[PDB]
Design a protein around this ligand. Sequence first.
Ligand SMILES: *[C@@H]1O[C@H](CO)[C@@H](O)[C@H](O)[C@H]1NC(C)=O
Lengths: 50, 49
Amino acid sequence: NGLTVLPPLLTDEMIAQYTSALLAGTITSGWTFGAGPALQIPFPMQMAYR
Amino acid sequence: LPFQQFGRDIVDTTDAVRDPQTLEILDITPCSFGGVSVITPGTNTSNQV
Ligand SMILES: *[C@@H]1O[C@H](CO)[C@@H](O)[C@H](O)[C@H]1NC(C)=O
């Protein structure tokens, strides 16, 4: 009675896209995409620095 | 069952009644309601809403 529920602004199908973008940026670029342009590096060469 | 009259839910609101004249159960649902919101650009720009 007078008690509604409002839906969120971002659906699940968009949060999934953000998560996938984060994964694809941290797999093929290392940590470099968090400070500027994203740069390539092979994965066994990223793990060496880690 | 052939001796109940009303119906009630987990929060104790009536949600089913049986008709006295013809013995049949009528489901009840409240009328629609909700909030109303107005979308507007600035009055410096337009007056459409
Ligand atoms: C009440 O009257 C109506 C009209 O004749 C009838 O159909 C109905 O069976 C009556 N109620 C009962 C409990 O018999």
